[PDB]
Every structure is written in C-alpha cells, then in structure tokens.
Ligand binder design. Structure first.
Ligand SMILES: [Cl-]
Lengths: 224, 234
C-alpha cells in the first residue's frame, strides 16, 4: 500500500555535530490510489525529539515520491545515538515508518560506554512484537568494566508504553564492578494480556554514580 | 470506573543534592464485584529520565504480580525512593498506575521538583518559558480535532537571549509529529517573545496519548529546557 524508504548520506558526526542529508522515498504500490500525510523527525539521547520536515499531505492522484531533506545537528546536542524517522500515516490509519541511525561524538560500531565501562544490552532473541494475548521477551545485560579501577554503577529498566504507562522491567540495582569484571544478567518482561496494544520502548539506564554520567539504551517491542 | 487510584508524596521540593521521597498509594475498588489488577509506581523526569520506584540490594528477579480487591475494599501501601544528586534538576512526575484485568488503565500522578522552585516557570538563567494548552483542551475526538498552544518566553536577563525553539507531538505507534519547526529567536533584555502554534490531529492519526513536547535551547550556553503537555485522541 505504502512503502517508505529512508537513506542518510552520512551516519557519523564528530562532537561538534554537522549536516545530514536525508533521501526520502514513499511508494504507492497497490492498485488503488492513496492519500497520506508524512514528516521527518529525530529522536536522540537525553529525551531529545526534534522535527526535520513539517507535516505534508499527499494524494497520489499511484506515483513514487522522492524528496531530499537535510538537517543540522548542533554541537549543544548530546553525544550519542540518534534515530531519524520517516513516518507516513495513510488516510485509513495505517502507519509506515522507515528509520536510520546516526551517531554524534561516538563510534558507530562500538558499544555505548561510560569511560571504559561498556554497556551491552540487547533484545536477546530479536523479538520485536508479541501477540495481544500476551508474550514474554528476555533481554541480555552485560556491563563490562574495562577500566583500571573499579566501576560503581546503578542500573534499571522500564517499559514506556501506550496510555502513559511506565512499567518497571528491572528495579534499581547498584553494583561495584571490579577492574576486568563483568556484571551479566538476563531480564525478561512478561507482557500480560491486559496491557494495552501499541508500542513499548524498553528503556535501560546505566549510571556511573561517581562521575554522575548516565547512558540510556532504547529497544522497541510492539504488542499487537 | 471500576478502580480509583490516589497518590500523595511527603514532599514536593528537593534541593539540587536530591533526597528521599515517601509516597502514599491508595487503590480502591468502587465496583460491585471483585477486581483483579496489577499496579506499580514509576517516575519520569528531565533529560529523558524514567525510573521505577523500587530498588533492590541484589539482582531483581521479581515478576509483575496481580492483586485483587473484593467489593468496596481498598489497598493502602507506602513506597519510598531516593532521588540521587546526579539526576538532572527540574520537574519530575511520580505516577501510580493500575491496569485492571479487563485492560482498563487508571493513573494518579503528583509532581516534585529538584533544584528549582515549586511554583515557578521553567527557566534558562533568567529567561522564563511559559507554554500552555491555550483553552485547556485535554482530548480530541477520534474523528479529529485541533489544539492551540500559547508560547511566551520572557527575557528577564540584562542582555539579549539567543534561543532555538521547536515542538513535536510524541504519540502512539512511535509517532513523532512536527508541531513547530526549529526557529531561532533573538530576544532583547526585558522583552517577551510570544506566539501561538497549534496541532491538527487528523482523523487518521492513532487513538491514544500524545505528548506535546516543546523544547527551548539557549544557543550560547547550550542549555536546554523541555515542557511536556498531554492530549488524548479518543
Ligand atoms: Cl530529603
């Protein structure tokens, strides 16, 4: 019905930021013509959300839409990982999204880290959705202390979902991790049948309580 | 309304060094029959902070377990949490949330502040930020509606303020809808920048909660302040 595609000309910025040029493709492939609205937005660390392209309505009367849109990422924005999202909502309510990530001030293919303490938190089996009748999704957590000295860390997780829900996934834990050691666990969330349908962001936070620096890791699961 | 939830905090104002907040949680069954539900207490704060009220000494292995209340009866529990110094100064929302077995959601929220005054506008060092749902429209019909917001930035500094401003609506299905494009304003000392910007919720947008999120940046100091307001599409 609609196929959305997003390409970024570049994916890695230095700490001072820079310019990213986006190529947007929206294809109406089906037999019927289609009306939709679309826009381009960015999500980043520290609760940053910002627009790159305003809401525009399109009636494919179908064609193929190709648009280039760039945006500046200023130095003041936090170093870390950002997600650019081309979003389309069709007249019938169907939602289509094409996302791409860029990083600022950190390496694209490295684990997030707090000055030598690396944070490896993953959706263990890559389960991106669960049935409306319920399902369970396990996550792996590995905090590896690559420093010469000990790391004093705090860790927790919530599920930020529909209807303003913020569901606890992992209570606040505190660990003193020796040099060279790793804190490892697997933690799952059971999505009970009663939880509302929609998108949940599994939000993991790790803090070095000595430096006071905090790193967040966000992972999406949809309940159908 | 099967369930009635209530929350109170023992204090609503912390210094920048943080502190300890005790909460009183009340969940009453108003229905004529037994109700089964799950409930939890969570906190949302500045800089994208979200955290659960619970802290454990070792490894958290607990499940989110259901409770039940027979006709007329009530659950009263107390929960406390530490707000560490490292957490950003600003406004926090504590939310008691209840999900009944039937899928119905009930919430009771209270706010506290850390390192800022309780009854004062959000501010960037003398530049105050006053952003409001203009007519107090908290929801729109599933068939669509429009909600205007007032924006007033008062520069109480001695020199001019250089700011960047934008708004989005963070909604269901991972939507982040542009509301106000990124603009840069130069505001003289003593002046107020005022505008009105609204968002049209098209009929086609998904039902559920939208957080209208306004962000203001002092582009000289690099400091950023957010203001979040909720609109529900039925
Ligand atoms: Cl205290």
């Amino acid at each position: 019905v609609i196929e959305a595609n997003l390409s970024l000309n570049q994916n890695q910025l230095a700490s001072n930021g820079g310019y990213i040029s986006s190529q947007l493709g929206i294809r109406n492939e089906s037999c019927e013509t289609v009306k939709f609205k679309y826009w381009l937005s960015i999500k980043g660390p520290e609760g940053i959300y910002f627009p790159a392209k305003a809401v525009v309505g399109v009636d494919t009367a179908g064609r193929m839409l190709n648009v280039t849109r760039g945006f500046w990422v200023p130095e003041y924005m936090a170093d870390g990982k950002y997600t650019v999202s081309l979003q389309v909502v069709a007249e019938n309510g169907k939602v289509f999204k094409a996302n791409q990530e860029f990083v600022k001030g950190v390496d694209l293919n490295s684990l997030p880290e707090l000055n030598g303490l690396t944070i490896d938190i993953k959706n263990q089996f890559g389960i991106n959705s669960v049935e409306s009748t319920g399902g369970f999704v396990p996550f792996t957590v590995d905090l590896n202390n690559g420093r010469e000295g000990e790391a004093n860390v705090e860790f927790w997780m919530t599920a930020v979902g529909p209807d303003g829900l913020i569901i606890p996934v992992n209570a606040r834990e505190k660990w003193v991790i020796a040099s060279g050691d790793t804190y490892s666990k697997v933690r799952g969330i059971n999505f009970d049948k009663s939880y509302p349908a929609g998108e949940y962001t599994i939000n993991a936070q790790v803090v070095d309580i000595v430096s006071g620096e905090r790193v967040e890791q966000s992972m999406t699961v949809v309940k159908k």
